[PDB]
Structures are given as C-alpha cells and as structure tokens.
Amino acid sequence: SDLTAFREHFAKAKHIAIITGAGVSAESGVPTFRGPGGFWRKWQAQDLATPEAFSRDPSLVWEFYHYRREVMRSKMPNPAHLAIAECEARLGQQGRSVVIITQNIDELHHRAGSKHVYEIHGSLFKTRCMSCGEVKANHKSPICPALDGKGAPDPNTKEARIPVELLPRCERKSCNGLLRPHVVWFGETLDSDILTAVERELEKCDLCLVVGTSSIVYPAAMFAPQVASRGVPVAEFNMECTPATQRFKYHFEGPCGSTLPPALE
Amino acid sequence: XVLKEYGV
Ligand SMILES: [Zn+2]
C-alpha cells in the first residue's frame, strides 16, 4: 500500500476530505458505550440514546449525557486530531482546503484547532429546544444545577429522578422548553442540509482520508463510492486487518495517533 | 432522510 505513494498524492492534493470515526475519539480515551463491556450503569448507548428513552425518562438520559459532558474535561485530543488541524492550517495558507466530516460528538476536532468541520451526528456541547427548536452551544459545567454531581456510572447509583422543570430549559423566557442534546439518536435521520454540504465537499475533493473507521461501513459508505467513482484516492487509517491476498490500495493499519502524523507532515 | 446507521 506504500507511504511514499500516498505522500506523492498528498503533495499534489488541493482539496482534501477527512472522514473520522469512533476510533479517533477512542484513542483519546472517550468511551463509546457500545458493544463489549461499555456499560453506563445497567445500560448501553443503544438503550438510552433514543427518542423513546428521552420521552420516557428524560432525567436518566440527561444523567447519561451529563456524565459524558464531564468526562470530556479530562480527555484531550490525541496526535491524530492535532496533525489534522495543523495540516488544515498549513495547507490553508497555501490555498488548499482540508475539511473534516466526523461521526464523533465530543468536539475533539474543534479543540485541536480544526475549523472546517461537519459534525454529522451533532455534538454533546450543543442543546436543542424541544419547543422552539433553537440550537445553541453549551459548555457549562454542570449544564444545570439539578444535575450537579449526578450521572455516576456505577450500576448501583440511585437515579437522580430530577423533575422535568429542573432539567435544562430554554433561556428565552417566553419559551422555557425542555432542552435535549443536539445529537442524532438511533431512529432519527441526519440533517439534509449537512449532507448536501458534505456531498458538495466530497465532489470537490481530490484526496479522501478515512480515519478511525472503514469505507465499507457507515458513515463512510454513504460517500466513498462517489469519490472513488471519480478516480480519487482513498486512504484508510484504522486498526483493522487486511487479508493476506487482497491488499487494500492505501490502508495504514495501526492506531491513528501513530500512523497519521507522519503521513500528514 | 438517512436513518442513522441505516437502522442497523
Ligand atoms: Zn425554546
């Protein structure tokens, strides 16, 4: 698959798109709460990250999202995040675009100094109002008083069972609607405006990077076929094996934080 | 609109 081959493309590329998956947030120690042993109390993300869960028990879901807003205070961007950001900046000066398209909701790309980012699953640090629909940034710790010191991850921990009026509300006073995380739950659709934009960006691009996920799976699978059908190279950087015989074009196996920074220098 | 993760 060869690094030099990749670097020759990288040198010439004027419009780079980098799609990032859970792997890159995992290297920063941010828990996914999915699959083997990633449990928050009795539940996993599948159970709590849904409209129904929120409608049924908005306290419990807000405990979950509060715990996750707070764990980010101690988790920092890994070198993949930074290498990307510094690349964007360096290339930008030269009149060369670098956009990030991320499934991750932790803002680690933003924290590493990336600017042109599309958070297709939203962000832990944005709220949406259930009444007026207003989307606003929110980095407050705690997000509201009632949740202070709540969200503890032990299967033991007693539910905070916060009254809905004391959960985060919409600060525009005529409204006072219940806020939810501005995030894409299971059973919800993506923003059409965001996908239209991403489509345009991937159509521009002449090098595409997949980092911390693969082309064959959501979300890369939506868009990689488009770029690939134009002859544009696609480089995967992730931790998955490649079969002995059927070597992938540009696949750099190993953790992003190691593989990516020398690729992008 | 696109079901997040196509549903499964
Ligand atoms: Zn409102």
Author numbering:
A (entry chain A): 34 to 298
B (entry chain C): 1 to 8
Paper text:
The sirtuin core comprises a Rossmann-fold subdomain and a smaller Zn2+-binding module. The isoform differences in preferred substrate acyls are caused by binding of the acyl moiety to an active site channel with isoform-specific features.
Attempts to solve a Sirt4 structure in complex with substrate peptide to study acyl recognition details failed, possibly due to the lacking stabilization by this ligand, but we were able to solve a complex of zebrafish Sirt5 (zSirt5) with HMG-CPS1 peptide. The HMG length is reduced through a helical conformation, albeit with opposite handedness compared to glutaryl-CPS1, to position the 3-hydroxy and 3-methyl moieties toward Ile138/His154 and Tyr98/Val216, respectively. Interestingly, Sirt4 also features such a Tyr-X-X-Arg motif in α5. The Sirt4 motif is shifted one helix turn, however, with Sirt4-Tyr104 oriented back to the region occupied by Sirt5-Tyr98, but Sirt4-Arg107 pointing away from the acyl channel. Sirt4 residues in the positions of Sirt5-Tyr98/Arg101 would be Asn108 and Gly111. Due to a slightly different conformation, however, Gly111 is shifted and the area of Sirt5-Arg101 is occupied by the Sirt4-loop residue Asp201, which would result in close contacts between the carboxylates of Asp201 and an HMG substrate. Sirt5 activity against HMG-CPS1 thus exceeds that of Sirt4 mainly due to faster turnover, and this Sirt5 activity appears even higher with other peptide sequences, but it is still 60–80% lower than the enzyme’s desuccinylase activity.
